[PDB]
Every structure is written in structure tokens, then in C-alpha cells.
Amino acid sequence: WTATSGSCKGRCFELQEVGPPDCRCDNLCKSYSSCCHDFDELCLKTARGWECTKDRCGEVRNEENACHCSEDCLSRGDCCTNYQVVCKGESHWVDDDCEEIKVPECPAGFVRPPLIIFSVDGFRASYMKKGSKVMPNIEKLRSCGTHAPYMRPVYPTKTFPNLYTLATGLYPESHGIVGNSMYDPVFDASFHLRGREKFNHRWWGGQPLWITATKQGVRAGTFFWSVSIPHERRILTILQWLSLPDNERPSVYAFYSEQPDFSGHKYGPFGPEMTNPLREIDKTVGQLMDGLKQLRLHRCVNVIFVGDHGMEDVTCDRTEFLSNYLTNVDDITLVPGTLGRIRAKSINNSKYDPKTIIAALTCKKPDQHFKPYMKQHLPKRLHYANNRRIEDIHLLVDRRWHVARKPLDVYKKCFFQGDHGFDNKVNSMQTVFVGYGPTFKYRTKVPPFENIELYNVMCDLLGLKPAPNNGTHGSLNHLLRTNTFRPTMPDEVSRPNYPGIMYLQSEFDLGCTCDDKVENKLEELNKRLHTKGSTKERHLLYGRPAVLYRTSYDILYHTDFESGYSEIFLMPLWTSYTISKQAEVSSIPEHLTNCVRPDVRVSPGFSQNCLAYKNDKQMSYGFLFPPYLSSSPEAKYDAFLVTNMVPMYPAFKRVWAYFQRVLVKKYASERNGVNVISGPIFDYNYDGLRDTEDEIKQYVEGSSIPVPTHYYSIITSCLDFTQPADKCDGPLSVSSFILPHRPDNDESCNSSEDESKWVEELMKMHTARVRDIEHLTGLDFYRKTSRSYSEILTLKTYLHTYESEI
Numbered sequence: 001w002t003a004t005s006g007s008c009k010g011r012c013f014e015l016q017e018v019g020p021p022d023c024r025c026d027n028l029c030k031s032y033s034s035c036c037h038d039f040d041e042l043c044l045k046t047a048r049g050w051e052c053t054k055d056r057c058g059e060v061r062n063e064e065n066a067c068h069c070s071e072d073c074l075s076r077g078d079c080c081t082n083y084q085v086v087c088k089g090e091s092h093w094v095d096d097d098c099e100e101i102k103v104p105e106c107p108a109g110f111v112r113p114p115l116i117i118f119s120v121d122g123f124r125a126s127y128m129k130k131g132s133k134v135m136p137n138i139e140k141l142r143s144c145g146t147h148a149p150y151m152r153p154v155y156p157t158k159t160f161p162n163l164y165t166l167a168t169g170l171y172p173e174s175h176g177i178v179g180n181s182m183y184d185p186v187f188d189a190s191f192h193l194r195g196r197e198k199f200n201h202r203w204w205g206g207q208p209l210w211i212t213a214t215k216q217g218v219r220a221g222t223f224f225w226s227v228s229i230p231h232e233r234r235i236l237t238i239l240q241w242l243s244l245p246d247n248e249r250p251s252v253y254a255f256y257s258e259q260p261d262f263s264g265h266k267y268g269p270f271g272p273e274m275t276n277p278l279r280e281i282d283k284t285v286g287q288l289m290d291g292l293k294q295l296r297l298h299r300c301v302n303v304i305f306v307g308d309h310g311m312e313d314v315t316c317d318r319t320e321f322l323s324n325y326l327t328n329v330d331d332i333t334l335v336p337g338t339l340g341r342i343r344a345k346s347i348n349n350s351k352y353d354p355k356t357i358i359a360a361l362t363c364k365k366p367d368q369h370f371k372p373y374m375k376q377h378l379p380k381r382l383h384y385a386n387n388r389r390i391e392d393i394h395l396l397v398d399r400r401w402h403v404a405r406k407p408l409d410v411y412k413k414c415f416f417q418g419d420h421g422f423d424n425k426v427n428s429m430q431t432v433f434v435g436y437g438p439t440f441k442y443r444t445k446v447p448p449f450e451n452i453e454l455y456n457v458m459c460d461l462l463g464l465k466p467a468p469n470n471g472t473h474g475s476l477n478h479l480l481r482t483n484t485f486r487p488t489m490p491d492e493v494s495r496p497n498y499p500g501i502m503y504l505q506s507e508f509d510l511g512c513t514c515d516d517k518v519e520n521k522l523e524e525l526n527k528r529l530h531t532k533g534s535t536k537e538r539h540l541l542y543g544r545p546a547v548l549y550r551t552s553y554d555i556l557y558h559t560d561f562e563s564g565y566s567e568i569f570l571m572p573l574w575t576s577y578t579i580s581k582q583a584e585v586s587s588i589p590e591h592l593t594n595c596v597r598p599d600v601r602v603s604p605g606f607s608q609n610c611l612a613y614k615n616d617k618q619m620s621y622g623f624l625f626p627p628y629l630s631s632s633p634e635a636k637y638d639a640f641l642v643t644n645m646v647p648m649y650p651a652f653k654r655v656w657a658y659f660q661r662v663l664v665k666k667y668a669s670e671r672n673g674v675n676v677i678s679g680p681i682f683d684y685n686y687d688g689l690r691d692t693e694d695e696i697k698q699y700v701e702g703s704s705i706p707v708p709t710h711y712y713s714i715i716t717s718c719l720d721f722t723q724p725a726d727k728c729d730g731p732l733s734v735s736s737f738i739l740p741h742r743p744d745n746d747e748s749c750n751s752s753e754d755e756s757k758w759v760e761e762l763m764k765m766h767t768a769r770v771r772d773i774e775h776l777t778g779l780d781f782y783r784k785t786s787r788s789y790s791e792i793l794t795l796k797t798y799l800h801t802y803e804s805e806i
């Protein structure tokens with residue numbers, strides 16, 4: 001109930017919310033059925049339309065009109081956006097040549113350039129090029145301001161998860177909005193687009209930009225606009241707010257458009273019907289910019305034009321049904337669509353088995369258009385696991401497809417030709433970014449980046465201190481003419497030990513054997529120098545990674561590779577090596593097949609042992625620096641040290657061996673040398689963060705040797721490939737991956753074939769940013785380069801996606 005019989009007289013779109021049962025006039029009142037009786041009459045005028053016409057010029061102010069052409073309108077802040085063009089002989093903003101904005105050009109009393117967020121739903125990246133003929137205002141913004149070829153949304157590439165990530169800089173797993181449809185088990189509540197449940201604050205974690213601004217004394221317009229409020233009224237409300245007195249005027253504003261997403265669903269992304277919505281959005285941009293020019297704010301305001309996600313061709317006849325795979329299809333609940341999420345229909349059943357459900361969904365049809373995963377097995381780059389609202393079973397759906405439970409749900413719940421929500425690396429899901437204003441650069445193209453990074457930039461743009469978030473502050477400094485934020489390298493917490501030869505062979509009882517007993521002062525001073533780090537300039541190209549937590553570890557030097565060896569985890573945290581274009585692949589000599597040698601630098605008690613691997617019938621081992629790449633027969637014995645060994649499932653050894661034996665050489669060959677840093681990752685609670693020792697759930701049997709959940713590698717070369725990796729004078733190029741360490745290869749439906757038909761495809765799926773590896777290991781890479789830190793941060797957030805050109 002609300003006593004909704006007061007007045008909006010003079011309070012249309014008020015900035016502070018009055019609490020019911022006193023009637024409201026803010027743009028949420030509709031949504032609460034709490035507007036005053038006269039809200040529509042006063043606050044939603046429509047008479048005479050949105051544009052001034054010649055005969056309206058200098059009219060008598062008639063307060064009934066939607067907007068004004070009278071003489072006093074500029075001062076009242078409520079002209080139609082084309083007033084000065086039609087009545088004062090001015091030009092439209094879009095017709096003016098663009099001129100660099102070196103400094104903010106703001107009216108007196110403006111303490112800072114305002115920020116206007118212009119967000120567009122379903123605005124696919126390729127609309128920028130493909131609809132450019134019909135979007136001249138947006139095209140001016142793009143080409144005169146700062147723009148990226150595309151911006152990467154978060155997964156799932158749904159509307160609420162993406163708008164709320166833009167507002168907070170958090171992954172959906174952290175902010176809580178994990179889909180457009182959710183069930184929380186602790187709430188026993190369901191969140192959907194339809195309904196009032198979504199209005200409860202309990203769903204929305206993190207700290208959104210409007211709250212960050214308010215707490216630090218920067219005033220915000222409202223971000224939400226009622227569906228029925230026309231775009232023209234939204235623009236005019238923003239322009240009015242910008243005319244308010246200094247102490248009342250907000251500094252941050254948002255506009256939101258339901259287009260082109262609304263039409264995209266009906267007609268597909270490139271439907272003939274799509275041209276008009278794009279014309280309409282452009283016209284709205286034109287109105288804002290003309291309105292700004294009228295108030296002399298068009299060289300004062302920073303404007304962000306930003307989409308939440310793209311749109312893909314999706315039809316009913318491209319639906320996979322779970323009823324075609326499962327016999328017990330009525331015992332499950334599916335969140336359906338462009339992603340699947342499965343849980344038990346009832347938790348008062350103990351005969352429900354996620355493993356048999358997964359088994360029944362794995363590689364069952366030759367052309368299967370989805371793949372099941374336990375959520376902790378999803379590619380780490382999606383950061384989609386660490387929330388109770390995300391079901392244990394997940395289905396990644398092929399682009400262009402849907403998954404549904406039964407056929408009845410598709411004809412009793414074709415409508416659509418477009419949808420979105422797929423893996424965020426998919427081209428059709430990419431969206432847009434343009435920054436225009438005094439704080440952004442002039443006519444600048446920047447590389448594609450992730451939408452998680454913008455919260456930090458918007459905080460910079462408003463002199464705010466960002467709440468803790470998943471952006472890497474400084475990674476987008478290159479978008480900005482002038483920067484609030486100067487990033488600094490985090491301090492190393494643990495410094496290394498540099499052990500020398502301290503143990504005799506016979507002190508070890510590791511159950512290891514090696515055929516190494518075959519014997520010169522030339523090649524003896526030489527091997528000493530190798531163990532003291534003479535070749536370290538070659539294998540450690542960007543300085544040793546810094547360890548950012550308290551621990552105990554040793555640097556180990558070798559001819560071919562250097563490592564940071566953890567005495568706590570009994571294996572390296574990182575192993576670093578350079579393979580030049582010229583370098584040769586050899587095989588492991590027959591006599592050295594089962595060779596594992598004690599490391600006389602490292603005590604028996606801080607070593608692994610071969611016996612545990614013998615007793616453990618599931619678990620074998622591999623090496624971080626590959627024997628296959630040893631520079632000499634003599635150097636190869638180094639690769640067999642117990643300190644280079646790591647636990648590996650035989651199924652995973654197939655993946656690993658193929659990478660070390662075939663792929664490193666190929667990359668070296670294509671990229672003109674590569675530097676490789678490889679190591680273990682432990683993330684048993686799937687939160688994307690390095691596990692402490694007391695979190696490890698699995699050990700090689702009868703030992704203290706912890707089993708990694710994943711193995712990473714970071715592969716760096718010179719961006720200018722005419723220079724070799726080991727002699728690069730400019731920017732770097734990197735690709736990385738975090739491979740799940742799995743006892744089977746069920747993920748790859750083709751794994752019975754040769755490694756050359758499936759392994760690379762799997763690695764591509766599990767591509768990662770260096771930054772994801774930093775979170776997962778507590779290491780910090782690229783500490784010693786010739787490059788600026790902002791550029792390095794940008795490098796660390798790069799993701800190699802393996803998609804073709806947008």
C-alpha cells in the first residue's frame with residue numbers, strides 16, 4: 001500500500017527518494033506503484049512532440065508542451081534539443097568539424113567535467129562498421145574520440161550480468177547477478193526479468209558506481225529508466241538536471257536504450273528490420289549532443305557510448321533437447337537457453353547423481369551442439385564458478401544454438417531470430433566502446449579490452465576512489481589524455497634462497513634411479529657457471545616473477561632453464577625458459593626413459609620421491625622444462641632432476657607431452673623464438689585465487705606432494721617478430737593458458753584420435769590472461785622490462801581468443 005494522493009508539482013524526476021506511503025516522483029515510482037496521481041500529467045508531457053518548428057520560435061511559454069521553443073527556455077533548461085538550430089540559425093553538432101578538446105571548456109561553477117554513460121543493449125561490435133552509413137552522430141563520436149574495435153562482455157553474455165559488471169567492475173560470480181534468471185538455494189528464491197523479486201537488495205553485491213559516487217560526495221542522476229518513458233524524455237531529463245544549480249547538479253549521468261537488443265531478438269542481428277533501430281539510436285545521440293551544445297557543454301562533458309553484449313542468429317529449429325539424452329529428464333530443473341544450468345528438481349531426493357547426468361550428456365551425438373561441465377571445470381577465463389547461485393552442472397552451448405529440457409518447453413512456455421548469452425570470446429557477442437570528451441584522447445584507436453576494466457576508468461573520470469574490483473587499475477590509462485591513477489608494482493613479500501651444492505647423493509632415499517653414471521676442466525668450469533646463473537639472461541627475460549605471499553622457496557639455475565622451487569609445495573612455482581627459432585627438438589634417449597635424479601641443492605625432506613608415484617596407481621608425473629628441448633645431451637640430465645618433476649594423470653600427460661614436444665617448437669618457429677613460463681596452479685575451492693597449503697584436497701598417495709588442479713604457461717615473444725624473443729627492443733606479444741589437470745579427456749570428444757586432432761583445440765578453449773595466472777599463483781610477472789608499467793598492465797590483461805577478424 002501507498003497513500004499515492006500528493007503532488008509532483010515542481011518535483012518531476014526528483015533526485016532523492018521520499019519513503020512511502022508519501023507519493024514519489026523519481027523514475028522508479030512506476031516500478032513500485034507509488035507515483036503521485038499527477039505524475040503522468042506533469043512529468044510525462046508529450047504535446048507538440050520533441051522538435052521545434054519555425055512557427056514555434058519565440059512562442060509564448062505554454063507549460064503543457066513536452067519541450068519549449070520560447071525565449072526563456074535556455075535559462076529554464078527545457079528547450080527542445082533542436083531549438084538553437086531551428087530558431088537561432090545554429091548547426092547540428094554532427095555537422096561541425098571536430099576539433100580536439102585539449103582542456104575542459106565548462107561553464108563557471110562546474111567543479112569537474114560531467115560523465116554521461118550512454119548504454120545500448122545488444123549493440124554488437126560490427127554494427128560500428130556495418131551500419132556506419134546510418135549512424136552519423138555515433139560515427140563522429142567514434143572517429144573523433146577514443147574507440148576500441150570491440151569490447152569483451154563478461155560471461156554469461158546476458159543483459160543484467162553485463163550492465164551490473166559495467167557498474168561495479170566485478171565478475172558476475174562476485175557481484176551476484178549470474179544470469180537473467182537465477183535461483184538462490186539459501187533464499188529458496190527465484191530472480192527473473194518479470195517480477196518483483198529482482199528489486200530486493202539482497203541479490204546485488206559489490207558497490208555500483210552511483211553508490212561509490214554518492215559516498216564520496218559526488219552526486220549521481222538515476223541510472224534506471226522506466227520502459228515506458230520515451231528516449232526523448234530521458235534525454236530531456238538529463239539536460240534539465242545539467243541546468244540545475246551547482247550544489248544540486250549531478251556529476252554522473254546514465255542513459256539506457258532497450259534497442260537494438262529488442263529488435264535483434266525478433267529479426268536477428270542483421271535483419272533488414274535492424275536499420276531503423278540503429279537510425280533511432282543515432283537520432284537520440286544527436287539530440288543529446290545538440291542539447292549539450294545548446295548548454296555550452298559539448299566540450300565539457302565526457303561521454304561514454306557502451307554496449308552490454310552483441311547478438312547472434314538463433315532460431316527454434318536449432319534447439320537441442322535434454323529429453324533426447326536423458327531418461328530421467330523430469331528429475332532435473334534446467335535454466336535453459338544460450339547456456340544451460342542443471343540442478344535437482346527436488347533436494348529431498350538422495351538418488352540424484354550429477355556424474356551420471358554429466359556422463360549421459362558427454363559426446364553422445366556426433367554433431368552435439370553443447371558440452372556439459374562441472375562448473376569448476378569451466379575455462380578459468382570465464383570466472384564462472386564461485387557463487388552458490390551457479391549450479392554445479394553447466395552446459396556451454398554452441399553459438400547459434402539453444403538448449404531446452406523437452407520439446408514442450410519450446411512450443412508451450414518460431415518467436416525469435418536472434419539471441420545472446422554464449423561464451424564471451426565469441427565474435428557475435430562482442431560489443432562497443434567509444435569515449436568522447438576532454439579527458440579521453442583525440443582520434444585514438446585502442447586495442448580491444450574487457451568491460452570489467454571500465455569501473456576503474458569511470459572512477460578516474462570523476463576523481464573517485466574505486467571500491468575493490470576485478471579491473472586492473474592502470475590497464476586502461478592509454479584511453480586517457482590525463483590520468484588520476486599512477487599504478488605501482490606490488491612489493492615482493494618473499495625473497496628467494498639461492499642454494500648451492502649441499503647434499504651428497506647417498507643422503508637421498510627417493511626410490512629414484514637414473515642411468516647417469518658416465519663421466520675435463522673445459523666443460524667443468526662451464527657447468528659450474530650454468531648452476532650460478534650465467535645463462536640466466538637468456539632464459540629469464542623479464543626478471544624473476546615476484547612472490548606476493550609469505551613462503552619458502554629457492555631459485556634454481558640450469559643451462560636450459562631457471563626455476564622458483566617451493567619447499568612448501570615440493571615443486572616449482574614457476575619454471576622459465578627460452579626456445580629460439582633455431583632450436584632443435586630431440587627425443588629422450590632409451591636409457592634415460594625412467595630417469596629421475598636427486599637435486600644436491602635441495603634436501604631430501606623438501607623433495608618429491610619416486611616411490612609415491614609407484615604406489616599411486618592413478619598418478620604419474622611429467623616435467624616442467626621438457627627434456628625434448630634440452631640444448632645438449634649433457635644438459636638433458638638437468639631436465640630429469642626431481643625438482644623439475646610435477647604430478648600428472650596419464651590422461652593429462654597426453655596433452656602436456658604434445659604441447660612440450662610439438663607446440664613449443666611451432667610457436668618458436670612462427671613467433672621467432674618464445675620465452676615460456678610454466679607451473680602448477682592449486683584452486684580447490686574454485687575462487688580464482690591461489691590456495692593456501694591447508695586448502696589442498698588431493699595428494700599423490702602416501703605423500704605430502706599436492707596435486708595441481710591446473711597447469712599454466714605464459715608464452716612471450718617480440719611484437720615485432722623480425723626481432724628474436726631474446727633480443728626485443730620494443731613491445732611484447734603474449735598468449736597464455738590454464739589447462740585443467742584432469743584424470744580423463746572426456747572434455748574432448750575426439751581424444752581417441754592423435755593429439756594433432758584435439759589438443760590444440762582444447763588449449764584454445766582454455767586461453768587465459770597473464771592476470772588470471774597472477775591471481776591463481778600469487779606471482780607477479782614482467783617485473784624487469786624496458787616497457788612502461790601501464791603498457792605491461794595492458795599486456796597482462798590481454799586475451800588471445802583464436803576467433804577470426806571481427
Ligand SMILES: *[C@@H]1O[C@H](CO)[C@@H](O[C@@H]2O[C@H](CO)[C@@H](O[C@@H]3O[C@H](CO[C@H]4O[C@H](CO)[C@@H](O)[C@H](O[C@H]5O[C@H](CO)[C@@H](O)[C@H](O)[C@@H]5O[C@H]5O[C@H](CO)[C@@H](O)[C@H](O)[C@@H]5O)[C@@H]4O)[C@@H](O)[C@H](O[C@H]4O[C@H](CO)[C@@H](O)[C@H](O)[C@@H]4O[C@H]4O[C@H](CO)[C@@H](O)[C@H](O)[C@@H]4O)[C@@H]3O)[C@H](O)[C@H]2NC(C)=O)[C@H](O)[C@H]1NC(C)=O
Binds near residue numbers: 171173175687689
Ligand atoms: C574480484 O574482485 C573481488 C572484490 O575485490 C574479489 O572478491 C573479494 O575476495 C575476498 C577474498 O575472497 C573477500 O574477502 C572476504 O570477505 C569477507 C566479508 O565480506 C563481506 O563484506 C564485503 C565488503 O563490504 C562484501 O563485499 C561481501 O559481499 C559478499 O557476500 C554478499 C552476501 O553473502 C554478496 O551479496 C556479495 O556478492 C559478496 O559475495 C561474493 O563474495 C563471497 C566472499 O565474501 C563469496 O563467497 C560469494 O560467493 C560471492 O562471490 C561480504 O558481505 C570476510 O569475512 C573474509 O574474511 C575471512 O577470511 C580471511 C582470510 O584472510 C580471514 O582473515 C578472516 O578471519 C575470515 O575468516 C573467517 O571466515 C571463514 C569463512 O567463513 C572461516 O573459515 C574462518 O573460521 C573465519 O571465521 C574475507 O576477507 C571479499 O569479500 C570479496 N569481495 C567480493 C565483492 O566478492 C575477488 O576475489 C576478485 N576475483 C578474482 C578472480 O580475483
Ligand SMILES: Cn1c(CC(=O)N(Cc2ccccc2)c2ccccc2)n[nH]c1=O
Binds near residue numbers: 028031198199202204
Ligand atoms: C536493486 N539494486 C540494484 C539494481 C537497481 O538499482 N535497479 C533499479 C531499480 C531499483 C528499484 C526498483 C526497480 C529497479 C534495477 C532493479 C531491477 C532490475 C534492473 C535494475 N542495484 N543495487 C540494488 O540494490
Ligand SMILES: Cn1c(CC(=O)N(Cc2ccccc2)c2ccccc2)n[nH]c1=O
Binds near residue numbers: 163227
Ligand atoms: C536496465 N535498465 C536501465 C539502466 C539501468 O538500470 N542501469 C542500472 C542497472 C543496475 C543493475 C542492473 C541493470 C541496470 C544501468 C544503466 C546504464 C549502465 C549500466 C546500468 N534503464 N532501464 C532499464 O530497463
Ligand SMILES: [Ca+2]
Binds near residue numbers: 683685687689
Ligand atoms: Ca582458491
Ligand SMILES: [Cl-]
Binds near residue numbers: 156158178179180181
Ligand atoms: Cl540466464
Ligand SMILES: [K+]
Binds near residue numbers: 615
Ligand atoms: K603411478
Ligand code: NA
Binds near residue numbers: 745747749752
Ligand atoms: Na574423450
Ligand SMILES: [Zn+2]
Binds near residue numbers: 159
Ligand atoms: Zn536481449
